[PDB]
Design an enzyme around this catalytic site. Sequence first.
Site, mmCIF file in Angstrom:
data_model
loop_
_atom_site.group_PDB
_atom_site.id
_atom_site.type_symbol
_atom_site.label_atom_id
_atom_site.label_comp_id
_atom_site.label_asym_id
_atom_site.label_seq_id
_atom_site.Cartn_x
_atom_site.Cartn_y
_atom_site.Cartn_z
ATOM 1 N N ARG A 36 -5.664 9.392 0.866
ATOM 2 C CA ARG A 36 -6.150 8.305 0.022
ATOM 3 C C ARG A 36 -5.140 7.168 0.085
ATOM 4 N NH1 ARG A 36 -8.953 10.937 -5.427
ATOM 5 N NH2 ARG A 36 -9.595 8.725 -5.672
ATOM 6 N N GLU A 40 0.838 -1.194 0.000
ATOM 7 C CA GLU A 40 0.000 0.000 0.000
ATOM 8 C C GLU A 40 0.873 1.243 0.000
ATOM 9 O OE1 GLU A 40 -0.380 2.350 2.636
ATOM 10 O OE2 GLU A 40 -2.155 3.407 1.866
ATOM 11 N N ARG A 70 -6.560 15.129 4.442
ATOM 12 C CA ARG A 70 -7.259 14.042 3.781
ATOM 13 C C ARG A 70 -6.202 13.017 3.378
ATOM 14 N NH1 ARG A 70 -9.077 13.890 -1.955
ATOM 15 N NH2 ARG A 70 -8.185 16.000 -2.083
#
Lengths: 299, 299
Positions: free
Chosen positions: A62, A47, A60
Amino acid sequence: MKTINVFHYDAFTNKPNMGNPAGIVLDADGLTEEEMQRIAEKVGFNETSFVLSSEVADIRMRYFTPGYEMDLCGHGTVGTIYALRERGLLEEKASLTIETKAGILPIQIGVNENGETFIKMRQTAPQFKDFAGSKEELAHSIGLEVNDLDVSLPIVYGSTGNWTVIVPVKNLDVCERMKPNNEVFPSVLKEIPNASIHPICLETYDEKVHMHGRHFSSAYAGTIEDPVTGTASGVMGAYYATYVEKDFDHEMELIVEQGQEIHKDGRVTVYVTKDVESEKLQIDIAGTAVYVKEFEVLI
Amino acid sequence: MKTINVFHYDAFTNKPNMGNPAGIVLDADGLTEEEMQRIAEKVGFNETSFVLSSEVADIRMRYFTPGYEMDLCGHGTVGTIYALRERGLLEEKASLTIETKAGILPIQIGVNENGETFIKMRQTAPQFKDFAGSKEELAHSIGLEVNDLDVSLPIVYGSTGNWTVIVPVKNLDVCERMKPNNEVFPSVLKEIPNASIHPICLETYDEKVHMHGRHFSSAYAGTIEDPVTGTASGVMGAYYATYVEKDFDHEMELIVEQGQEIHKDGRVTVYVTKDVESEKLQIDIAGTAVYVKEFEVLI
Ligand SMILES: [Mg+2]
């Protein structure tokens, strides 16, 4: 071509190479979602996270695997917030909010006894189901025999966000012999055929630690074994508080370890809280992280 | 849960509501592609632009129709840069670069002959193909008789970025009679069925301008008529230099007007250079823009 600097931090460890890799782009505001997906593919880690501006939270984030976007990734959050904090890239505060596709996540930033920064987050309230399948078939699926299981503790499916099977085994010598046959898991795990399998024991390699586990991926995952798994660790904490050491008032914590059998050394701190108005335990986890390397990706 | 300020500036005009509406989000770094698309859909303008961070240019932009993303939008770029400058959000400079999915666009800024601020853009070298279909069907598709067409000038497909059909017609009276039947265009335009249709004449409402155009959208578009069209105006300048007056020294400028038939009044300045390198025409366009309104969009 554009040049993107990507960091590799290992989550849930204080030593390089001994944790769960987390790719990080520290300021991704210059990138499209297609670029993010391509960067994650080229990075090729399990990841890679991307730090972004938010209308509704401090930041934020992602999260992308090499092939798709994830709504949440606990170890990526731990590694990424640790990196931002340790690099001087955050405001002067001990908590943060993170906008994600699964909602706004409150994060606590603390320091453990050893002076290491720890990143703490809430998991989903625990759920358990009894395992009603064949213990011998289960043992065989992980390369063991039936008398390698610990008869004194129950085999259960557990989730604090993702379903895994907690399989108590006798000791570390048993863990060292395991060999996952992941493809056969669905046939053994009738109730939840796509669950991972997470064998555990109370004997540990590390002194400060209360439980040992190993993580074998579901048949549907492609991979065989995960180095240090925050989701399953939360389940182990709930399991410990429910089956092993039940006598506590209000709050308890434990450290679980993972990865030693594959030459790593991961630790996850699990906080188990009960409140008089709450129907279930509350589970938080925390981990530290460590810089591994930085490199360039062209896109 | 998010309140987004959307600006509306009209491109290619100095009078509010006399140009091509450009929806603009001045800082879109908090938004996903899905959110940008949803904002564009709610706003309903032919195009809404989003200003984003860039690591390789002064700013980055993404362009959306109410239904889908576009690679390029001249009028949106003009409106957006004009707005950023007006509100002091860009370093005040005569040149800048914009990162887009289709490449980095160099932009020039200055004051035009009329005393207004212009935004100037480079288009692609002109490509032409003769229209070989039925002039009758073509005339009827725009609500005309074949006699209303100007036989003395050629009907051509032309592109400096978007394919359109340049259709010379008699005069302004004939232009006012036109009514597009866009749905039939693909059946008429056999060679390039997805082209728009752009009738022209040299008679103009403003005596200080050189050519008059009107723009009927492709069948595929979500519109019927575009008020002031930058791409087609660049094609018109190329067309002028290629088919009307081929005799000029190295470079010429003309002004094209568009929009009067729908009660607007747009202007595009077209720069035609005989590029010695490419040995082909080089085309730039420029126009001004004007604030119309600001409003909130909740997503
Ligand atoms: Mg962005």
